[PDB]
Structures are given as C-alpha cells and as structure tokens.
Design a protein around this ligand. Structure first.
Ligand SMILES: Clc1ccc(CCCn2ccnc2)cc1
Ligand SMILES: [Zn+2]
Length: 286
C-alpha cells in the first residue's frame, strides 16, 4: 500500500506577513494519522486551532484566509502548495501572529524546510479524492474546472495587458507524473503591478511587500535588478496558488484542474461546488 506522511522533527522559521507587515514566528511539528494540516495561533489564550479545509475559508480577497469565530490565519496558499507538493498528509503549523510569513514569495523556503524535517511514513493507508465527473464554475470571463484523469495535471491561463507579455501565450501546463513540483513550480514568486499595490497600501494592506519578497512591475518593466526565475513565472505562480487552494480538500487529488483568469475566490467556489455534488467524487486507498 501507499502510506500516510508526517514530519520527523520540529522546525522553526521567521519572517514578515505580506499584507500585515508584522514579524511572525512559524513552527512545524509532526501529527498523528488522519489529522490533516492544522493551523494553530499559539499567541492567544486560549490557543485557536483551524484545520486547513475548504469549510474554514472566511475571506478570499487577494489571499486565502482561514477564519474561526473572530480569529484569522491569513495567506496559507504557498505553504499548502508545499505540503501538497511533498505529499504531507499530517502536520501542526503554530503561528505567533495572524499571517503566515511571505519569505521570498514562493514555496521554495517551505519545501526546503519540510525536507529539513525528514519524512515519517506512518502506519495507515494514504487517502486520495478522485474526480468522477466534470465540475466547473464561471464568473464573467473567468472559469475553473475539475475533469477526471488517472494522474494529477494542472493547467492555467492569464489575460493581462503589458509589454512583459508581448509575444507570449500566458499559458502553462504541468503533468506531475513527468515533471518535478520542486524544480518546475516551487520557485515562482508572488507578483504585483504598481497601481494594484498602491490601491492595497491605501486600504492598509500589502504592508510587508517589496522587491525582496515579490516581483514588482511598472508601466514598462519588472523593477527587480536580477530578473525572472522562469520565462513564464507569473502564470507558474497562479499554478502554485491553485495547488495550495486544492489541498483544502484535505487530501491529494486524482484528476485534472484548468484555470482561466481565476483566483482565490473562484478556486474556492469550485471546491464547495464539487464537495456539494457527492456523485462527482469518492475517497480511495491502494
Ligand atoms: Cl508587493 C506585492 C505584490 C503583489 C501582491 C499581491 C499578492 C497576491 N498573492 C498573494 C499570495 N499569492 C498571490 C501584494 C504585494
Ligand atoms: Zn501566491
């Protein structure tokens, strides 16, 4: 059989919240079988625990935000993209504050951190959610869809107007049978156009953001001296985001996803619509 996975050792790291600006301490620990990924606010009395499941998603406005009563955990998508990408079923994630640290804006630092723990194969068969029927959601020109597939394959498309996309498809597919998450996806960074960023900073958001933890773009060009990590880094990051938002199903996926111009909100509507349509999915082991 294929068996469940957790970490071997505790791990710490440090950083700033992309939106919040606050310094935050992160700790990863091992977890028993059938626990899932669980976020814990350790700065509060009592301590607040929130499973990383579609049911706990409070806001979806330019991040994915876990909510429980009056308490937030902000911007969880990149860490979960990482936990998805190394097949981590079980793990506790303690935070000193309300936002996960941005680090370099990619899953790079999380993917290495988890490898630094080591991998514990646990005595329990791994569970997958398999797609049985087509499911899709639309909103204006936007679209997100699950199709059945004996594998795991993600595709995405964006549709921006900018010099930087001149000549380009703004299109990327990745079949994870034949490519590496860590190599071909994990490193793509969070991006932002100046105007979008200034509109956030007027509403008391994007406070930890700069060229150290994100790609910034003016009317002309990428402002980052050292340039891009891939020729298609922007659409690659939308795929990394999608992979984090899907891991809110609580298990790894047997199927195919396709996004067209979609984000945190439409990605989450697709989960709820699939979950609600019982005949389109089933839990399975090997
Ligand atoms: Cl500097 C800066 C640039 C872009 C954004 C938008 C973040 C959108 N996002 C967040 C996580 N993944 C994508 C914020 C600050
Ligand atoms: Zn992102």
């Amino acid at each position: 059989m294929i068996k469940q996975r957790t970490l071997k050792n505790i791990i710490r790291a440090t950083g700033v919240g992309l939106h919040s600006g606050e310094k935050v301490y992160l700790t990863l620990k091992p977890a028993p079988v059938d626990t899932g990924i669980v976020f814990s606010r350790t700065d509060l009395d009592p301590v607040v625990e929130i499973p990383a499941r579609a049911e706990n998603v409070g806001e979806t406005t330019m991040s994915t935000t876990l909510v429980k009563g009056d308490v937030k955990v902000d911007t969880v998508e990149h860490l979960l993209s990482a936990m998805a990408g190394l097949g981590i079923d079980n793990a506790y994630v303690e935070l000193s504050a309300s936002e996960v640290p941005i680090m370099d804006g990619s899953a790079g630092p999380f993917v290495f951190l988890i490898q630094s723990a080591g991998l514990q194969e646990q005595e329990a068969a791994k569970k997958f959610i398999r797609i049985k029927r087509e499911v899709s959601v639309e909103e204006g020109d936007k679209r997100a869809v699950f199709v059945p597939f004996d594998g795991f394959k993600v595709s995405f498309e964006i549709d921006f107007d900018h010099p930087v996309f001149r000549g380009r498809t703004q299109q990327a597919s990745v079949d994870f049978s034949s490519t590496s998450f860590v190599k071909e996806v994990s490193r793509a960074r969070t991006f932002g156009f100046m105007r979008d960023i200034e509109y956030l900073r007027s509403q008391n958001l994007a406070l930890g953001g700069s060229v150290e933890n994100a790609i910034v773009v003016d009317e002309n060009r990428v402002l980052n001296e050292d340039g891009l990590r891939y020729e298609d880094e922007f659409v690659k990051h939308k795929i990394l985001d999608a992979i984090g938002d899907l891991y809110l199903l609580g298990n790894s996926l047997i199927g195919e996803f396709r996004g067209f111009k979609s984000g945190h909100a439409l990605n989450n509507q697709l989960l709820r619509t699939l979950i609600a349509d019982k005949d389109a999915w089933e839990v399975v082991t090997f």
